[PDB]
Structure formats: C-alpha cells, structure tokens
C-alpha cells in the first residue's frame, strides 16, 4: 500500500526500511527540520530512495492546520500514516486523510503511561512489565484503539536504553511491520482501550529529572535508570550539576569497604566514593550504587574516580 512515514530517528528509519522492503510504496516522508548540521536518519534514507521528504518547522499556526504544508502532504496520496516516534503536532486533517487513517507506535501498554516519556515511566514506577502498543490515531493523546501490543518483562536494572534496545526497538519495528500487513488484509482490529489502567505523565527534560533524595534507595535507583541515559537524572554537587548513570541496588556484607565521603546537599546521609562506583543512600537508609558521573557537557567519568 500507499504509506506516508510522519516521525522521525533510527526507529523512523528502521521501520521506513522494512516496510519499503516488504514492497510497500512510501509516498513519502514527514520529519523535523536539519538540527542543522544534524540531517534526521529517517529523511537521510527516503532521500538516498528517491523517496520525497518533507521537513515542515509546523503544520499548524495559532492552532489552524497551515494550508501549505497540508497541500503538500495531501499531494503524495498516502493510503495509510506510519508514525514511528512523531514529535511534531499533525492536524486530524491529516491523521485522518489517508483511507485507512493513521497508525501510531507507542512504547508502552496502552491505557498504561500516555505521553512521551512512557519508556521513561515504566522505569520510573518500578513497573514489572512493560512493552508497546499499535494503536489507530484519533484526536485525543495515545487514546486512539489498539491494533496490536507485545510485552516484555523489565528486568530490574533496565534503564532506557536497555530495554529500548532489547525490546522496544526491534520488536517495535517488527509490530509496525506486523500492523501494515494486517491493515493491508482487513484483519486488523480496532480493540476500544479500557478505561482502567489509564495514565499520563509528563514530558522528562533535564530540567525535571533532578533527583528527589526523600525516597527510599529502591524509588531513587528507579528514577536514576529511568532517566538514564536521557535525559539523565541529576543532583548539585560541590556547587555543581552531576547526572547519575548505571544504577544497581546493593546489599550488606563486612568487611570489604573504604569509601571516601561524599556530601551531596539533600542527600539522608552522605554519600560514599568507593572502587566500583558512587554508593548513594535512600531515606531508608538502603543503598544503591551508581557507576557513572557526568558534569555539565559531560565526558562520563566512573563513579569511583569522583575525588581523582
């Protein structure tokens, strides 16, 4: 079928390649501007295909669908919408254009974590499986109904980028693949999300990643891994910003360890530098070890050689 890919990032790319690979004609591609010396994976691919791209700043001003960028998109006649990892706002005009509408990826269980941090979220929380949805775009935020959805556990040190590159990316690609090949038969379903379970939560940036020390050890190594690598959690040390890489919870057994105190303002107690990493204490008086730092602009540098 006819497919316009609107999104954007290697994902975007990935499932362009399969989905053109499994003779499908992408009409063409709709991605964010250069970033700039940054041309984004998805429009370097379409372009090196022949394949049209578009890199439209908006398609909406003063909330009204800009008329330019909806002619242009309406141009390629799309039969169905393939929307990787959008960040751009696109007008129902258009999800709603193609014949089959529009299909967007999610990585989360749907109704569980709506929002554009869900990956982070499921980190956050501590939640025990995780996994992503396909679901038909409607007007509302990750409310649309479902077409498919896979699981997978969460393995108790995952971070972001475990599990993203475990799971969520390559079998992503392949339920994105899965979910076309269904459309294309007339199978796919249309599965009303339930009402229970449903939440949101906010978009992480740097700036609400900071680290909440009143918690116990085991909410403080989820929030770490959960931010971890972006946009990474992060505490003011000595004066300055320090993000938090690579957490594990730890346990007890003496003698072996030496650390070099450190005080971290807020902290239950002081933290401890020690051979292998930065030991962080929670409210409970638990611990968790973290085995990377980074400073503003940060080079990474091991936990261990804070003083050094």
Known sequence: MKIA????????QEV?????????????????PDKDGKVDPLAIEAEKDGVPV????????????????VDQYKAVGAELNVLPFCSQFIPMEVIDHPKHGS???????????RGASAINWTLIHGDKKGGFTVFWADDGLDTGPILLQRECDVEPNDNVNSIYKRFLFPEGVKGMVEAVRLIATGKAPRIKQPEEGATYECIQKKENSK????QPAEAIHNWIRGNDRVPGAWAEIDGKSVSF??????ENDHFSSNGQPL??????????????????????G?????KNLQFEDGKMIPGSQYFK
């Open 245 to 250: 890489y690579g957490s594990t919870l730890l």
């Open 103 to 113: 299909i967007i990826y999610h990585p989360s269980l749907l109704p569980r974590h």
């Open 211 to 214: 680290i909440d020390w009143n």
């Open 54 to 69: 578009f890199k439209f700043p908006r398609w909406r001003l003063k909330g009204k669908a800009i008329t330019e960028v």
């Open 286 to 290: 638990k611990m968790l070890l973290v």
């Open 263 to 284: 005080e971290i303002p807020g902290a239950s107690r002081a933290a401890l530098v020690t051979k292998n990493g930065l030991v962080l204490f929670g409210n409970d």
């Open 16 to 32: 362009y390649k399969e989905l053109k690979n499994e003779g499908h004609m992408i009409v063409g591609v709709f991605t964010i």
């Open 5 to 12: 890919v609107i999104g954007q990032s290697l994902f975007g």
